[PDB]
Design a protein around this ligand. Structure first.
Ligand SMILES: OC[C@H]1O[C@H](O[C@H]2[C@H](O)[C@@H](O)[C@@H](O)O[C@@H]2CO)[C@H](O)[C@@H](O)[C@@H]1O
Ligand SMILES: OC[C@H]1O[C@H](O[C@H]2[C@H](O)[C@@H](O)[C@@H](O)O[C@@H]2CO)[C@H](O)[C@@H](O)[C@@H]1O
Ligand SMILES: [Ca+2]
Ligand SMILES: [Ca+2]
Lengths: 588, 588
């Protein structure tokens, strides 16, 4: 009877509209403290307005315990109501059999609860589809491929930066190196991406900027000339779309580069610049004391990304900045037909701006995908009026920690369960899962070149609800420590490529696209079956996909599956340490 | 170590911006389970970017336990950060001395926590004043007076409805009666309101509509002709403002009356009406089966307020309806200079609309007050982008229950504490407290004509953080059961007025306006000092206001205060049953 562990927050991920007449409701309780939960629910006005003797509270609805995070249990139910108005309360029974009703007014014995008073209950006052979260269906069928354009392929030596180094995937790049990768190189290798099976390309920034990473934007309205031009970008988008590949660009709106027209005008004109209030300048002249690290100053007189004086923060509260950034966001969509924006440092820009951004994008393309780069929990951006999803760093980070270290399977399952219970169910299917990127060490380096372990991490991640992404070169086993070492030139020489891993990744992508993505409204189940042994199940009403992962130090025997989809051991029943086996079976 | 009872929700009432460099942070724990909480907080980027050996987590900030609701304890701290970016985590110690760190990643031993990783922490990513909640300062100095215009004063017999009854405050009105109250009558009695000390008038609907209550609107752009005309309403607003009285009107936007041009066009033209999609019509023709209750139909083919066929619900998702309602909302503000809108059935209209409404009102009048009529918890409307406040029905309902029944003082204090902890501190000071209205029984009836009890309820309510309101006639002791009996004609005959209660209400209003409202950033303390004995304290750094309420069945003795403000017993030390005493003292 741990009443302090019970919570329902109305109008949240715990109470939300799925369609015009249907809502999903959740309740949190302390782990294993509550044995059953029923929902009392119906139209608030029905209690006293309708002449019938029936009352909605006389027909409870059972809730189901769907997940546990080791601290709390989470219960869920779907409710349909034709009047589109809902009052509800929870009947909770603890392990000793003590039942209470829990409502907007607190905890009561049922005999003492004011069940005829609509105001006793929690409320979903009218079911508003305009306020609901919507997931674009095309994302569910996508496997993404992330390209850092300076390092994917050089298709044109004539646009190379001064000082471009010979293309060599065995180099350890410096922070300021150039290798000459560009948009023609991407166009040249679309066949490779189609053969791998990917159906979306995520590019890091491509707009004019002085650096190799291009997060210090000089002009958002121009493709960087070392990458290409507008005609070539249009050609790339149309060629991608012809092959069934969607395109996501990186919007760097939190900060601008110090070589932009706007910041240079501040440096010339100080507070007489018309752009002074496009920034966060505390003292004029806008200045800083240089250090031996180009990306660090201790005392800049203006807010920046991190402490780098080269990335002054934009004032997105200023209506001129809003209009400028919305016009950029609209231009690339309208003129080039991109399918998605990935929003850099999205958490540091205000919600007012992101609501205007969402409204503008959805007015152009109702199926647009808006992905925020946020490393921490992101509930306030994922209500339905701002982003579609965020990068799911905490979820994939938990997976990596489990496979690479020695924690219990229980610990991993608790972390993943906690993550899913932060968000609406449809949101969880839009979250973007990548195990590495241009800002972390490469998978094969984290795995200490253990390819079996890398395959297990990828497969476990590709079974999760979110949408997977492959960082360029993962499919050939590329290594690298953190930035800049995670930005090696792509390995194009066959003698240096891991052909077995490439073949495996094609098979894994196929399972994702042809089997997992094609279940109908599936659910996920996590079972800990032994010391560091996990069974993952995804199932709808016809079909169940099951994956067993043996990450202990002993052999594990399973029943021989009839229809094996993917496995690492030659045996159909035995999993040695770090093996896995994925199979499909009819639901009986 | 009830970890299931510990919760922090980032970006919520538990973590919000107060000003450009300052945030307030709260933590929930299980009642009396956690002995101390410290906050570890600072700029996320400082941990790894700054060359200093100092780290923000080495200087914790103590949190204070501010409230308890009987189930949970609530802790709070204010943090200032010049970089305007905050990462934070909680150090929680239980009664056995077990300490854990609690962060966005869960619960850890301090030795196991990844304190150098900014992503370990909860985040306030940048302090956005554009997203913050703002309270208009003028509301803090207000005492409101609610007028139901058909029943306050008849200043013009010539505009009376057909069948208007003689003015008689001893009648028991029927649902369809008219007594002829109008705007000239309000204008005629502004002296009474000024002498009482009120500084805001809240009117129920005044726009053209067939009924005596005018919630079934016929034309939102016209003062009802039985009430007045535009010139007379302007004269009333200017006369109120000249006396320092602000004006709030009632916006009935959830539903329209069936005699409106728009609904009549639906009845004439069916789905060929241009207004068909201004409503929620499930089947044409739009119809219902009449019953013996004018306000009830079981089978209307369109959504309505409650089950009344005369109030078809408006489709506020439709952009034409949005534009129509925003133009109404703007017209009364721009042309007549009203100070506030009270939003009828506000919970049943979508958040998308209320955000546009908020933006439009604040662009006209940055200090505008937007008050939602919502009976249940209202967190999602009180973030800072929709309403300023709601009617505080749950808070005043808890006060009434305590004074009128026999529950413990503990129960009342727990309920009030729960309410305050739902919302930001500034929001709590904008919540609108009325003990009765045109939809509930009158105070003097609930109190069974016990005037001492009525005075105690009013005084206790006027000491609370929210803004108080007096329903017309309360100051003379008017009685009435629920609607329509709570809408008696106002008592203007001195022989029928309670002159002692009027004198008391003047004194109570004076304490509110001259003492309580003029504390500087006060705090509230609730102390249960005995069986049904409560001490309320409000204090800033110079001054403390204390009120003791004896609602048991025994006498209570207190120390003689030096400066008594208001009391009911003749003694300066003794409180008999249902007495109270309010005093002021310097803070030592
Ligand atoms: O010069 C600072 C920093 O800028 C870029 O970092 C990006 C990062 O890659 C993004 O994923 C995100 O976190 O925002 C940062 C700022 O835009 C460079 O990629 C990085 O090498 C460099 O240190
Ligand atoms: O005819 C239905 C009903 O309409 C009005 O009720 C208002 C109520 O007074 C408001 O405070 C709020 O709850 O919305 C209702 C619908 O607008 C009348 O005041 C009431 O007499 C009548 O029964
Ligand atoms: Ca090139
Ligand atoms: Ca009249």
């Amino acid at each position: 009877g741990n009443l302090a562990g019970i919570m329902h927050r109305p109008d949240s991920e715990m109470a939300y509209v799925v369609n015009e007449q249907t809502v999903n409701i959740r309740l949190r309780t302390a782990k294993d403290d509550i044995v059953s939960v029923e929902l009392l629910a119906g139209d608030p006005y029905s209690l006293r307005s309708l002449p019938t003797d029936e009352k909605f509270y006389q027909v409870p609805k059972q809730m189901t315990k769907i997940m546990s995070d080791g601290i709390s249990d989470f219960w869920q139910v779907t409710v349909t109501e034709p009047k589109r108005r809902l009052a509800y309360a929870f009947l909770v029974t603890d392990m000793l059999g003590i039942q209470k009703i829990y409502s907007d007014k607190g905890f009561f014995k049922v005999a003492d609860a004011d069940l005829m008073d609509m105001n006793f209950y929690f409320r979903m006052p009218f079911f508003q589809t305009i306020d609901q979260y919507n997931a674009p269906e095309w994302v569910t069928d996508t496997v993404w491929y992330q390209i850092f354009p300076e390092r994917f392929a050089n298709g044109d030596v004539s646009n190379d930066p001064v000082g471009t180094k010979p293309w060599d995937s065995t180099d350890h790049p410096g922070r300021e190196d150039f290798y000459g990768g560009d948009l023609q190189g991407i166009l040249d290798h679309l066949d490779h991406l189609q053969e791998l099976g990917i159906s979306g390309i995520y590019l890091n920034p491509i707009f004019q900027a002085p650096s190799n990473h291009k997060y210090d934007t000089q002009d958002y309205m121009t493709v960087d000339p070392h990458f290409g031009d507008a005609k070539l970008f249009k050609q790339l988008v149309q060629a991608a779309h012809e092959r069934g590949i969607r395109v996501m660009l990186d919007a760097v709106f939190n900060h601008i580069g110090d070589k932009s027209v706007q910041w240079q005008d501040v440096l010339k004109n100080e507070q007489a610049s018309p752009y002074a209030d496009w920034f966060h300048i505390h003292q004029f002249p806008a200045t800083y004391t240089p250090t031996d690290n180009f990306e660090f100053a201790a005392d800049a007189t203006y807010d920046t990304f991190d402490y780098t004086p080269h990335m002054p923060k934009l004032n997105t509260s200023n209506p001129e900045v809003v209009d400028y950034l919305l016009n950029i966001a609209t231009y690339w969509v309208k003129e080039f037909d991109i399918d998605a924006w990935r929003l850099d440092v999205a958490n540091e820009i205000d919600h007012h701006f992101w609501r205007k951004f969402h409204d503008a994008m959805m007015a152009l393309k109702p199926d647009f995908y808006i992905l925020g780069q946020i490393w921490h929990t992101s509930q306030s951006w994922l209500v339905g009026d701002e982003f579609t999803a965020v990068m799911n760093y905490s979820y994939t980070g938990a997976i990596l920690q489990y496979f690479l270290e020695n924690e219990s399977a229980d610990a991993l399952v608790q972390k993943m369960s906690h993550q899913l219970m932060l968000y609406r169910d449809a949101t969880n299917r839009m979250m973007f899962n990548t195990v590495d990127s241009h800002d972390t060490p490469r998978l094969m380096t984290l795995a200490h070149e253990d390819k079996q372990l890398a395959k297990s991490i990828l497969t476990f991640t590709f079974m999760q609800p979110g949408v997977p992404s492959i960082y360029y070169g993962t499919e050939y086993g590329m290594t690298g420590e953190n930035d800049p070492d995670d930005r090696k030139p792509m390995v194009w020489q066959p003698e240096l490529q891991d052909h077995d891993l490439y073949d495996f990744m094609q098979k894994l992508v196929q399972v994702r696209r042809q089997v997992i993505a094609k279940l109908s409204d599936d659910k996920i189940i996590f079972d800990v079956i032994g010391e560091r042994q996990i069974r993952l199940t995804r199932e709808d009403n016809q079909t169940r996909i099951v994956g067993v992962f043996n990450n202990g130090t002993t052999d594990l025997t399973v029943a021989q599956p009839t229809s094996i989809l993917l496995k690492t051991n030659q045996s159909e029943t035995q999993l040695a340490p770090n093996d896995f086996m994925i199979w499909t079976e009819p639901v009986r």
